[PDB]
């Protein structure tokens, strides 16, 4: 895989790597909940006066 114009003893053969970014996926770290409460009350009161 040494490219053919590098085969000459005077032409140096070396890799040039670089990384390039195509997306960025930010994920918001937030937590949420709900609640549902249904009560019932039975007041019974006697009252002598």
């Amino acid at each position: 895989n040494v490219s053919p114009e590098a085969r000459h003893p005077l032409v140096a053969a070396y890799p040039i790597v670089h990384v390039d970014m195509e997306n960025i996926i930010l994920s918001k770290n937030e937590d949420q909940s709900t609640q549902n409460t249904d009560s019932q009350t039975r007041t019974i009161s006697k009252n002598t006066s």
Binding site: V11, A12, A13, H18, V19, K28, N29, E30, D31, T37
Partner: protein, 392 residues
């Protein structure tokens, strides 16, 4: 009947990150087990994190002019900071608000780990040596050779290096004497079929030789003793040396600071856009020069009456997406792609067609100051002036 609803947070861990990256090798040798250190920069230089790539983001071989992962596939995900990829990349509250407001985030490549593979004389197989890496080899190439960048083959920077002589070091005074003509003939494929150093079609006098500071200080002292004045005549007497930079460009265009062709001069734009085969009210089958294709943004139609005026349908920069690039070596500039498949505003053959062009030196992408989202900030060179029935 009660109903509640909660939304927590944490102002040190309010977001996570996930970068989709891809590696490119543009050298002349392959590199094995690539692991690039790389850093996510917010704003101007506010670095969130620096991550050497883990084993999930490890390439195994990156041959020259190849991508990892390959170009038909999707990029790899970088979402780790632990050495075992068990810890995400976080972001606090201020950085999250600022990134969601201004949308600035880049990724720098600091350095790259990677092994070397060598021929083994017993069985001819190629063995990857895990004790060696290219970080011990590139600083020895960079201190004993001479760099020649060149962009005459389809206008991209093709960097090579030729082993030249350093006069203040005894081991490097042993290499053969390297001239500039021989360096161009063995590094890039310049040939002299009639005693003239040419490329495939051009001549060497169609290029220009921008040097560095110390290299130009050497070239002028070399041309003093030569008793010559033009560089293009005495290419076969210019000795090269170590730590030289030479930059050879095409004489037909202009370039930015980053040495990319962002616009030509005004003459050469019209000289290769004129051969036409198909013509109708549906589309304009022009041909476009490959160099000037890289600087043109898009074509904008116009309507002119018997007297002579302007009628620009596409006074909006998101209607500059008119170009088509087919397989038959031409473009096909349509007319109904940004008119909802309703045709042009042509009613008479005496009404002529006109398209005015613009290069990337002369475009705008963001809005203007007050109200010119139209074509008043578009600099135009006269390319297209023909009648409406000669095109259809």
């Amino acid at each position: 009947r009660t109903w509640a609803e909660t939304m927590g947070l944490n102002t040190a861990d309010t977001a996570r990150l996930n970068a989709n990256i891809r590696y490119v090798n543009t050298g002349t040798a392959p590199i094995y087990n690539v692991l690039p250190t790389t850093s996510l920069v917010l704003g101007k230089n506010q670095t969130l994190a620096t991550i050497k790539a883990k084993e999930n983001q490890l390439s195994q071989i990156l041959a020259p002019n190849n991508y990892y992962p390959s170009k038909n596939l999707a990029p790899i995900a970088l979402n780790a900071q632990d050495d075992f990829s068990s810890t995400p990349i976080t972001m606090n509250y201020n950085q999250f608000l600022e990134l969601e407001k201004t949308k600035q985030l880049r990724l720098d490549t600091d350095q790259v780990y990677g092994n070397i593979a060598t021929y083994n004389f017993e069985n001819g197989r190629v063995r990857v040596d895990t004790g060696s890496n290219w970080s011990e080899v590139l600083p020895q190439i960079q201190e004993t050779t001479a760099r020649i960048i060149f962009n005459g083959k389809d206008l991209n920077l093709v960097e090579r290096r030729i082993a030249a002589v350093n006069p203040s070091d005894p081991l490097e005074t042993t290499k053969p004497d390297m001239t500039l003509k021989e360096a161009l003939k063995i590094a890039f494929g310049f040939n002299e079929p009639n005693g003239n150093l040419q490329y495939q079609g051009k001549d060497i006098t169609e290029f220009d030789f921008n040097f560095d500071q110390q290299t130009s200080q050497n070239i002028k002292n070399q041309l003093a003793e030569l008793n010559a004045t033009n560089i293009y005549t005495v290419l076969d007497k210019i000795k090269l040396n170590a730590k030289m930079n030479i930059l050879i460009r095409d004489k037909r265009f202009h370039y930015d600071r980053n040495n990319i062709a962002v616009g030509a001069d005004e003459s050469v734009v019209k000289e290769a856009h004129r051969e036409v085969i198909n013509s109708s009210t549906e589309g304009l089958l022009l041909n476009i020069d490959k160099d000037i294709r890289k600087i043109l943004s898009g074509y904008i139609v116009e309507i002119e009456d018997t007297e002579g005026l302007k009628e620009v349908i596409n006074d909006r920069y998101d209607m500059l997406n008119i170009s088509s690039l087919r397989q038959d070596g031409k473009t096909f500039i349509d007319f109904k792609k940004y008119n909802d498949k309703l045709p042009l505003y042509i009613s008479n053959p005496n009404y002529k067609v006109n398209v005015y062009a613009v290069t990337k030196e002369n475009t705008i992408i963001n809005p203007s100051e007050n109200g010119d989202t139209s074509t008043n900030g578009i600099k135009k060179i006269l390319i297209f002036s023909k009648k409406g029935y000669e095109i259809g």
